[PDB]
Design a protein around this ligand. Structure first.
Ligand SMILES: [Cl-]
Ligand SMILES: [Cl-]
Ligand SMILES: [Cl-]
Ligand SMILES: [Cl-]
Lengths: 96, 93, 96, 94
């Protein structure tokens, strides 16, 4: 027997908008090295793709941008990865 | 190209092999810790025949249930108690 | 590219870096039988000694550090063995 | 209660009369990552004996680059037999 796990993984499918991009901002970065997932959603822009989809929320943990893992990624590099992502993006996130 | 990769793996348990892999990890997990990894993959088993899962891969979820904060002991039970059809989210080098 | 019934044994020669150390992390349990080998590679840092050498990968099994066997060695003790190792390290590992 | 064990690489050459000059024991039903092969005897005057390192009780971990993880006693014998004349063993010792 064990304590029931609390969190879930979700796949969020978004399309970049010329005006919004993906319509969210991030906070954080790795501190503990290669396996550290330190990136979280800091805000979701009203009327943007993430908002309209409805799933992504401030506080959610960002695990991947399509297949690109954010494990061990700095804040700077995470910004880069999001910027360089194609128009069609699936975010793997964990949620409370 | 330095980033790791996130992949989804769909497996069906087999009578002899189960899912066809073993896991390792500690028992003390912080709420957001992901400490479950693959230690071996059985030749002939579903994981092997599927071809994606490898030793060293990091197990992130089982049928959408996150392994964040989940101990090795709890993860074994989750995998053993899982239905025949499982979708795994993993990270890979 | 499926798993082989026979695994592989490999020697890896690394030099510690002042910032990276050996450039990898390990995982394993704390309870070990005297002959158990429960230590495995969990990550390899891009640009670190292990990465540049190109042999060591996550999932590899750590068998010795400069002839010191990991048999019966707990995760906490293995970390200490890697920390206490000199600059020039020879690893014996097993690989899938 | 006993110090860390020691891993050694032993370089031997097969001999026409002695082979490698040692025998092994172990079970047949190994798990994937089990290492259940051990040295049982070392022949006086054969390669292993002359080399001086290998002793009965030692654990045999590999034959050249072939791991004995999950390898049965039967299969280990065949791995040793099939090996070329130049052989490197990885062993563990007390
Ligand atoms: Cl394996
Ligand atoms: Cl690392
Ligand atoms: Cl890695
Ligand atoms: Cl012994």
């Amino acid at each position: 027997g064990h304590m029931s796990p609390e969190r879930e993984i979700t796949l969020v499918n978004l399309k970049k908008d010329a005006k919004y991009g993906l319509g969210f901002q991030i906070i954080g970065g790795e501190k503990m090295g290669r396996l550290d997932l330190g990136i979280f959603i800091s805000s979701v822009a009203p009327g943007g793709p993430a908002d309209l989809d409805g799933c992504l929320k401030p506080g959610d943990r960002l695990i991947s941008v399509n297949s690109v893992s954010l494990e061990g990624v700095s804040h700077h590099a995470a910004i880069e990865i999001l910027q360089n992502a194609p128009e069609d993006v699936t975010l793997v996130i964990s949620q409370p």
